[PDB]
Design a binder for this molecule. Structure first.
Ligand SMILES: CC(=O)Oc1ccc([N+](=O)[O-])cc1
Ligand SMILES: CC(=O)Oc1ccc([N+](=O)[O-])cc1
Lengths: 752, 752
């Protein structure tokens, strides 16, 4: 007999038609639309489509409540703990309501969704308690606008609300149009938990309401959902100064080596067929099986698939529930109808809201379906010959979120895991989640991390605000001919090169004296620099010891020319340059120091083993330097970036380019490998959009303005972006290390 | 053709008879004794036996130089980097001199000893650079007295001097009597590196000179050597306020499972035979082989041992050098002569200063050789049937330093590693060392860690001093009989218990009002508490989440009785108790927060894989609370200790015991597992020595005085000790987490 929904129905009846939860109170129901149980077609409740005025009021209430909420972290901790206690007390109600609203099996809702939501609040309460003492250099961002998908309604809510509240922010959150009910129940327990009025605001509606929230006067936007919508959100927030995190697409590859525990790998896959829907950090949808075991693996997988029970989601014996909505059923049907490759195996005939577990096997490594978007309870599979080929297939995508690797050999499993492009890799498991273990994407899977200490940075700002120096116009001057050869070039791929466009501008000092000429770089020069960075990919695999040695050489070699660099700075700016040179040397030595000291973090989890939140390079970074600090600005951004294993191309100070061109000889003398540091000079209006747009750059740092253009263009490949503030006079090294790294969490067996 | 020693002989001829290196200068040669090349028997140089006056002068010069040296971390980083560059430039000289002085093969000196010493200085330079910004809460200790053994003379020097200088301390270091030369060459390069006069002082001599240094006016003593000497150093420094680190005995077990890569495990072990001598954190000397592979493993081991080349250590093809001194040769011969068990395999007949690689196999798990000290190039081996038996055998020692585990299976290797009592565990390797990876012991292998961020705490003090409150004499009263039942008891093993001795004292308020009676605990009560903590060993294997939940309950249940506890405090002290109760609740919630957030640190290393510097519980801690803060002192020490997975026995405030006895109900209502928290009341003069002596306690925290008695008694089992300062009104939570944890560094394969 299925679980009783009587208490869920009673709550829905008490709530009647829903308005919104704004300023601690329930508003009048407005423009109502039915929310439907997908398993039965029956209307569960009427829910409102929020108006622009509703969003405005929600944001105004969050803004009003934020200063007093921010003031006492211990008080926030008690509230987060109370919320966790209420989720636990009402766990059966939350679980039944989630099944009624979304269609998922009640067994998943009770055993996974609700317990993980509870633990997220329990765990994050402690971050509120410790923020003042352990993060004293950090402060809240303010108001967060948050948008979540329909696949895990309550758990997605927890992943958004818990860290935001812990760090002293208030929230305006919209649940997915199809699944509002558990978010409304969460709203309904906020008063009992002591959530002060306006600290949590929940508004309901379609994507138009999501766009209203994203474009509202919020300090942070956090979104989980499709990559296509993430691009639109990046564009709609470009130039606003908003903090932005995106958890996007990329259902993960599942690599099964010849020496895997076959039966366990099969069981983890079958247990994930229902889970791996919508946008969530998961693995198993793309199956990569080594040739030697492929036939036995598929035979076992089909047999285990046949045992999955499809039906009434309120029955705790059911494994496969109802599809969330008829539009999602149509998506899966259409995907199947459009595919012509492979062999299709389904355990049942599709009937009503129930789509059967489906395996599409026999695909080639380059088939469209291995890389195309997947809908429904569907797995696609291919084979591989060698572990190196598995890595190649797994990484042959625009995505990089979660992945799973199966092997019984301790050496092979730990060799494969770090080579996968991903923010999460599970060894001998899949879909393992904990509040202490960060998760998030690289590439087109987005950016930012949710969970752990690592997730808190994205909900905070520096406690002491820095300000980027104002732009400086280049000096003008006479323009007489130069009979000497004083025309500086570009530095690309370990050698000087002429600008592709052939042009240079005269550089004058503060009194109008001609100092020399500097090249005007173009998009072709940038293309050449990116090619050089691609050739230097081995730098991203060097040891920290080696990178430290190089940075020490750079510092020593600049020190040997310190007087000369101070003189060049004074020639260009009219101000003594000794202090800027000393600071630049210091930045190099601090970056050298950090190159082998920026440690990953080991997470104890209440699951099997440990989660290793590793630090890895971002990859290739294009950087635009400020006008001020002609040497220190360049060195301050270059040095931490290469210390962390990235390759960089920097557009030097537009106004004062000749300190950076003098720096070419320092790079050469220091044996900086070709392509690790490339330097362009010239007009940042020519370079900002090409650098932010470039599909082969992993991050763009624009510290000379053009923030809107840079952030909008970054949506092409969803590269990370940083547009300041950046004050070169201040030591930003540690903060820059975070801009210069990604967190990759590897889950490993561990006997403690 | 052996390596040329011409330059080494020329340096020795230049320096002639040696004095000491004090205040930046070489002192006159004094009471001279020959230092002898063990391979040839020839005198290399005459070296002085330092006098008390020499030690005093070295300490005085170190003290004079320290304040200026502390001021500028960037300047120290330049000096440390210059020392590393000098070790590298002169690497061939350092390596030859090490071989001449100590007898080790030149191949080891060139490939291992000198490179690791260079790397230690390169790496630690960066900590000097970063100390001001990344460790702003820390300051230098002052002057460090440092004593090192003869097995790795230069490398042992680097492990001592590099962190000490990085943290702004100055040093007085004595090399081992038998191997002074590379330390004297290190002294001779200090001027060239820019070491300010007196920042490094090197004095030579025997153990009497070592004792002079340890008992001198130094702030820190750091020693590597025998456990027996470590005990004497702990006794000689007891009650002086000196920081102390000890890296002692315990050559490590080498666990070879049935599914190990046998050839790799054999090659790793044969390559370690020469290395595993003296006191160093190594593994291989105690071979534990699973029964199924024991015969094949030993057959391969004997064959590979036969390939080791013994002879002139200046020949780069040589694997087994000369024993360091005839006294060490006698030690190994006598050990072999004393053994009557097992089967002795030696690859050659002993001859001159050369003792052959030796395998003593077929021993029972409880054989004299399996547990007693090992000398020479000697391996001892036993077998095991199950991995659980391997763990029992490996842990059946008074030691816990390094260990190695060999298995190809991902589960078994990572399951065995946390179960071993050790500060270092290598998976599928041995003797892996890096400047960023901490190493150190538990149990009778000592305490403290060398290397990494983790090693720096032992070379620093809090920048802001805390002061322990003055003792408070209990109030007196008339002595009338109490017609009511107000005699508090003890709390041991989950229940209240009568004091074994049967005595209680009257407790009076400030004006003489009888408040009740409190038990006078005795050594038997402590014994019962220790037995209860042993029964609660499962607490040390719980999840952080579980421990957080318990601490949250304690905080909630104290909150529910807040007025009652404030009233009890005011009854006893005459001062309002509300703020003390509020602080106590805060400490509980901060410890709850930390219980699942005190993360281990992942070290990138230039070797194979990664090193995981994990946090583990200390185990069982005995704690003596101050008189002041009758509730807050107890709660502040208890809460972070249990949050980190320890079990504790606390002696409550002697003057004001009744807040702690009221707290028994809070523990019971909060479902604290039996034996995790035990509380004794009574006179700390009765309890301090028994707690510090107890051989079944892993640490003693004495925050009520008795520092000399506690520190001297702790030498029995070399338990960790903390004798303050401790101000209950100060939030010590973060520092207490460090007192309450050990660092265990697990080296694992990794493909990045
Ligand atoms: C801000 C923007 O450009 O578009 C959006 C479209 C839809 C949603 N949504 O709620 O799914 C959010 C944002
Ligand atoms: C301080 C003390 O009690 O004795 C010592 C004996 C020997 C040494 N040593 O040079 O190895 C150091 C200290």
């Amino acid at each position: 007999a299925p679980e009783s929904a009587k208490e869920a129905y009673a709550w829905l009846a008490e709530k009647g038609d829903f308005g919104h939860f704004i300023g601690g109170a329930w508003t009048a129901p407005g423009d109502l639309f039915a929310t439907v149980n997908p398993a039965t077609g029956q209307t569960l409740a009427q829910v409102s489509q929020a108006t622009q005025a509703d969003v405005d009021a929600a944001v105004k209430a969050a803004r009003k409540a934020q200063p007093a909420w921010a003031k006492d972290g211990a008080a926030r901790a008690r509230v987060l703990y109370a919320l966790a206690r209420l989720l636990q007390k009402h766990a059966r109600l939350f679980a039944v309501l989630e099944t009624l609203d979304n269609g998922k099996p009640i067994r998943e809702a009770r055993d996974i969704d609700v317990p993980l939501a509870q633990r997220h609040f329990y765990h994050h309460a402690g971050y509120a308690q410790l923020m003042g003492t352990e993060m004293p250099d950090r402060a809240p961002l303010g108001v967060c606008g948050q948008v979540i998908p329909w696949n895990f309604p309550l758990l997605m809510l927890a992943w958004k609300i818990a860290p935001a509240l812990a760090m002293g922010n208030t929230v305006v959150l919209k649940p997915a149009e199809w699944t509002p009910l558990t978010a409304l129940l969460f709203a309904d327990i906020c008063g009992q938990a002591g959530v002060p009025a306006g600290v949590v605001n929940i508004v309901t509606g379609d994507g138009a309401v999501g766009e209203m929230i994203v474009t509202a006067q919020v300090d942070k936007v956090a979104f989980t959902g499709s990559t296509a919508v993430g691009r639109r959100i990046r564009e709609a927030t470009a130039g606003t100064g908003k903090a932005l995190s995106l958890e996007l697409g990329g259902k993960g590859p599942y690599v099964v080596c010849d020496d895997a525990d076959i039966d366990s790998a099969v069981e983890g896959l079958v247990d994930a067929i229902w889970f791996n829907q919508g946008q969530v950090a998961c693995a198993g949808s793309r199956l990569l099986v080594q040739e030697g075991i492929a036939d036995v693996f598929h035979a076992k997988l089909r047999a285990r698939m046949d045992s999955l029970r499809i039906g009434d989601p309120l029955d705790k014996c059911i494994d496969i529930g109802a599809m969330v909505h008829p539009d999602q059923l149509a998506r899966v049907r259409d995907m199947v109808a459009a595919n012509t490759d492979g062999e299709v195996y389904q355990t049942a005939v599709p009937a009503g809201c129930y789509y059967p577990p489906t395996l599409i096997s026999g695909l080639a490594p380059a088939s469209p379906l291995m890389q195309q978007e997947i809908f429904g309870p569907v797995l696609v599979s291919t084979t591989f010959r060698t572990p190196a080929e598995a890595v190649e297939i797994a990484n042959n995508t625009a995505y990089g979120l979660a992945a799973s690797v199966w092997s019984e050999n301790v050496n092979l499993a730990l060799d494969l895991a770090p080579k996968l492009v991903a923010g999460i890799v599970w060894i001998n498991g899949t879909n393992m989640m904990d509040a202490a273990a960060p998760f998030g994407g690289v590439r087109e899977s987005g950016f930012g991390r949710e969970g752990g200490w690592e997730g808190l940075a994205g909900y905070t700002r520096p406690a002491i605000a820095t300000k980027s120096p104002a732009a400086v116009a280049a000096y003008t001057g006479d323009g007489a001919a130069d009979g000497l050869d004083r025309t500086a070039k570009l530095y690309i791929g370990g050698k000087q090169t002429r600008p592709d466009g052939g042009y240079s501008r005269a550089v004058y000092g503060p009194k109008g004296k001609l100092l020399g000429h500097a090249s005007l770089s173009n998009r072709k020069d940038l293309r050449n620099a990116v090619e050089a960075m691609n050739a230097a990919s081995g730098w991203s695999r060097t040891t920290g010891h080696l990178r430290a040695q190089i940075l020490y050489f750079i510092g020593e070699n600049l020190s040997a020319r310190a007087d000369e660099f101070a003189n060049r700075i004074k020639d260009m700016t009219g101000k003594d340059g000794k202090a800027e040179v000393a600071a630049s040397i210091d930045r190099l030595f601090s970056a050298a120091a950090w190159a082998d000291k920026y440690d990953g973090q080991v997470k104890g989890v209440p699951l099997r083993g440990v989660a290793l939140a590793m630090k890895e390079p971002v990859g290739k970074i294009g950087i635009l330097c400020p006008d001020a600090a002609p040497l220190l600005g360049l060195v301050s951004l270059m040095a931490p970036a290469i210390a962390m294993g990235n390759r960089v191309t920097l557009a030097a100070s537009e106004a004062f380019p000749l300190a950076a061109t003098d720096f070419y000889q320092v790079l050469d003398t220091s044996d900086v490998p070709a392509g690790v540091v490339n330097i362009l000079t010239g007009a940042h209006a020519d370079l900002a959009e090409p650098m932010a747009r470039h599909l082969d750059l992993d991050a763009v740092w624009g510290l000379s303005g053009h923030a809107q253009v840079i952030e909008a263009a970054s949506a092409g490949n969803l590269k990370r972006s940083w547009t300041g503030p950046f004050d070169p006079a201040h030591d930003h090294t540690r903060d820059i290390l975070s801009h210069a790294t990604e967190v990759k969490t590897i889950w490993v067996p561990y006997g403690a």
